[PDB]
Amino acid sequence: EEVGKALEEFYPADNPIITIVKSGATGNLTQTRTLAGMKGLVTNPKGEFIPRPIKSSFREGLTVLEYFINTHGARKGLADTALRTADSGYLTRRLVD
């Protein structure tokens, strides 16, 4: 949180990266912090946070172990998104009926 606040304060008002976000055209400040500030915490395959965070930012480049632990959430999201639609379709069919 503090790193994100510092990053938001530091960026000039006319910098393209933050101008894209502040105008509301695209993105949000969390993505900017991840790109520049620091990735933060990541989850296990069980969905629980790993105590040790990814202190590196994609600008700097994650190390091997940080990247490997990061892949867990990326792999989980692919199935999570697919499964999320089933409950929505169930409720929508009930409501339509």
Binding site: T81, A82, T85, A86, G89
Partner: peptide, 30 residues
């Protein structure tokens, strides 16, 4: 019936193939 109501893989319109609900969950579990 709810699972059948969803779109099939034969006629998707997305840019690339992806996981569908029918590939991960069955009627009994849903």
């Amino acid at each position: 019936g709810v699972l059948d109501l969803m779109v099939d893989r034969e006629d998707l319109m997305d840019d690339e193939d992806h996981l569908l609900a029918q590939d991960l969950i069955d009627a009994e579990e849903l």
